[model samples]
Target: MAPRGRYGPPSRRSENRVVVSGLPPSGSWQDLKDHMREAGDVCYADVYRDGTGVVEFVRKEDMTYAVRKLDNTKFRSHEGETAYIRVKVDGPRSPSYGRSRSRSRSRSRSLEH
Candidate 1:
């Protein structure tokens, strides 16, 4: 897959996570899993009553592929309401990510003797 803008590097590309949005109001776990079957294998999945949720892919490539194929696609709800959903690779939630940002900010500050 091509490089993602603002996404770190190959090392960070293996996060295998994605944030799914615009889900149907009655979206269920099984429905979400079934919907993404063509996109990728969902190792973990959960959804809110409003149909937004996070998904973790078992494979890094699967995550990237799912994002490419699923983003901005038209999704139909059980009631036949058509809505456009968006899929995007999740940002790193690791503590290391926070530390890296903090360290960079600190380095930019001038220290006086």
Candidate 2:
């Protein structure tokens, strides 16, 4: 299971991990990394153009702050576009990464008539 933190999933583990999603419309993952760098060290970051994605950050305090700050904010893009990406705080438990993928596949299969 992905450990919970203040900013990522919200499972509430040590609250040291934060996950950021919703890559800005006119921005790349690098933008998020640069802007969020002040918070703390980033373990991994990825940007997707398909309107969906996730970024992980280390440091408990930074992660927690990110959740409270980013989750509720309608971050603006460089082009003034609003990305509907949601920064959900992840918890450390269960299958974590595996669970998300399996659930997605299940949903996709169910959608197929």
Candidate 3:
């Protein structure tokens, strides 16, 4: 598995990761990277089979800026479909307040009862 935090692996310093949607099914990692380069340097990008995936920025802050710059913008794929890129911070939530923490607390309470 990739990794799991409170909700998922992205919970901590989630700014390092950005979720990108609206990619064409044919989109490639390099294509995503190139499209995102306008904001800053891209460490890497992963495209899912469903045309949506996440991109990780080398500098955490780069993703913040990129997300702001790329979200709602349009990217034309070679397949001839115009995709409006949606960007979002990928993460679960703070350890102090997330589904996992709550679930654990509830389980512990039940055990105590």
Candidate 4:
């Protein structure tokens, strides 16, 4: 069946989101969410491969609270590493940024006999 009705709700965007950095290598999305919940309800949470994460709150106030209350805080990961995470508002993109790229090559053969 084809998808309909806009597929889903509008993207919350980065407005109510916060950037969390300095996470331990082993930290997970669950850990990020659990820790951020101390400030407010986390609507979305994800951890990047570089030990960074993003947390989205249900409200703008919650995002602000998280930035003020959670920044520069020590976080103990499940792997037993403690890191001082930095929480900041998700601001607009800066200049000199580019999209990620991938390289793909396929083989082609032609015969004339």
**Per-model lDDT:** 0.69, 0.59, 0.74, 0.77
Against the true structure, candidate 2 has what lDDT? Answer: 0.59
- Across 1-113, the per-residue lDDT of candidate 3 in tens digits comes to 25444543444453467788888767787887888888788888888887687888888678878778777789777677778878887754464634554344444356354
Tens-digit lDDT track for model 4 on 1-105? Answer: 233455335565544777888888677988888888898888899889977788898988888898898778898887888889999887544456554322122
**Higher-TM-score candidate of 3 and 4:** 4
- Cα distance off (Å), candidate 3, residue 95: 17
lDDT of 2 by residue, 41-110 (tens): 7766666677655566776666766666656555556666766545666643464445563233444365
Per-prediction TM-score: 0.65, 0.49, 0.67, 0.67
How does candidate 4 fare on TM-score? Answer: 0.67
Candidate 4 local lDDT, residue 62: 85
- The reply for model 2, stretches above 4 Å from the true place, is 1-17, 41-43, 92-113
Which candidate, 1 or 4, has the higher TM-score? Answer: 4
For model 1, the stretches where C-alpha displacement exceeds 4 angstroms are 1-15, 92-103, 107-113
Which residue pairs clash within candidate 3? none
Count of backbone clashes for each model?
0, 18, 0, 0
lDDT of 1 at 64: 80
Worst 10 residues of 1 by lDDT: 95-104
The count of backbone overlaps in candidate 1 is 0
Q: How many clashing residue pairs, candidate 4?
A: 0
Give the range where candidate 2 is weakest over 10 consecutive residues by summed lDDT. Answer: 3-12
| Top-TM-score structure, candidate number | 4
Those runs of model 4 whose alpha carbons end farther than 4 Å from true positions after fitting are 1-15, 94-113
